[PDB]
């Protein structure tokens, strides 16, 4: 199962001239395109070696698309100051995420399209892709405007059309790093503590793609709120890392079990110390 996802952000900077508009594109967990309005002569650039041999007609079309969006977000930004009556002195943040989840058989499972203002949800396209969900009475103004204007339809057409078509195309050119599943390197480590007991940390290194669960068990029972867990972090080699740890009594470190589930694991691992 593959996905093509785009993350868009525009942030205002009062006094500090025009706001910053940027776009980052991903396939699965792999970055491949970038946009930044603070670069002089703002144009679209490749962020993965396997995409750069797309042609100029592609990039120019992508420069055209972004710059067009750059305008909508400046205009959208000022509208936010009236829906909410906020100062024209402070800077604000508007977010946007759109993409598609596609099964290996070319069929999609889910498509996203959704906006967030000042770090909080705002409006979002529903799973069924037909009506909008507005967060508040400031966001519901937009709903009516876009329902009458039949906005939802055009949005739906990208997801169903171009997104699927270009993912199938993307997936044939960068298959070296995209069509790959690399297994986790797991183990458990022991660390004595000043407080008199022990910290057991479970490791999972070098796996790809990035979806993974790490878990601790005390003879079959899970200690979720007892473990401390970091977020999945990139190792920078196309692979990822993660760990989770618990605190156990000296002498009972071997009663606790650690499990790792991933695509790169034919059968789910089980580890102890």
């Amino acid at each position: 199962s593959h996905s093509l996802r785009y993350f868009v952000t525009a942030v205002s900077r009062p006094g500090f001239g025009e706001p910053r508009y940027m776009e980052v594109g991903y396939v699965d967990n792999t970055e491949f395109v970038r946009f930044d309005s603070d670069a002089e002569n703002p144009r679209y650039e490749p962020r993965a070696r396997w995409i750069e041999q797309e042609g100029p007609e592609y990039w120019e079309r992508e420069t055209r698309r972004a710059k067009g969006n750059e305008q909508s977000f400046r205009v959208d930004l000022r509208t936010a100051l009236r829906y909410y009556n906020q100062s024209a002195g402070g800077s604000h943040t508007l977010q946007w995420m759109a993409g598609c989840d596609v099964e290996s058989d070319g069929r999609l499972l889910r498509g996203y399209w959704q906006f967030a203002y000042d770090g909080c949800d705002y409006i979002a396209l529903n799973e069924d892709l037909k009506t909008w969900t507005a967060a508040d009475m400031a966001a519901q103004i937009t709903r009516r405007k876009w329902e009458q204007a039949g906005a939802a339809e055009r949005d739906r057409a990208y997801l169903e059309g171009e997104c699927v078509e270009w993912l199938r195309r993307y997936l044939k050119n960068g298959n070296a790093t995209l069509l790959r599943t690399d297994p986790p390197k797991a183990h458990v480590t022991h660390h004595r503590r000043p407080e008199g007991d022990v910290t057991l940390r479970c490791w999972a290194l070098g796996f790809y793609p990035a979806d993974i669960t790490l878990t601790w068990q005390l003879n079959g029972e899970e200690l979720t709120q007892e473990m401390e867990l970091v977020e999945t972090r990139p190792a920078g080699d196309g692979t990822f890392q993660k760990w989770a740890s618990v605190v156990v009594p000296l002498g009972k470190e071997q009663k606790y079990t650690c499990h790792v589930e991933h695509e790169g694991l034919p059968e789910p691992l089980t580890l102890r110390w």
Binding site: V8, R61, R65, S72, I141, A151, R154, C163
Partner: peptide
């Protein structure tokens, strides 16, 4: 290829 706001503004 990304999506376009198509000037569907709020």
């Amino acid at each position: 290829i990304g999506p376009g706001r198509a000037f569907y503004v709020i």
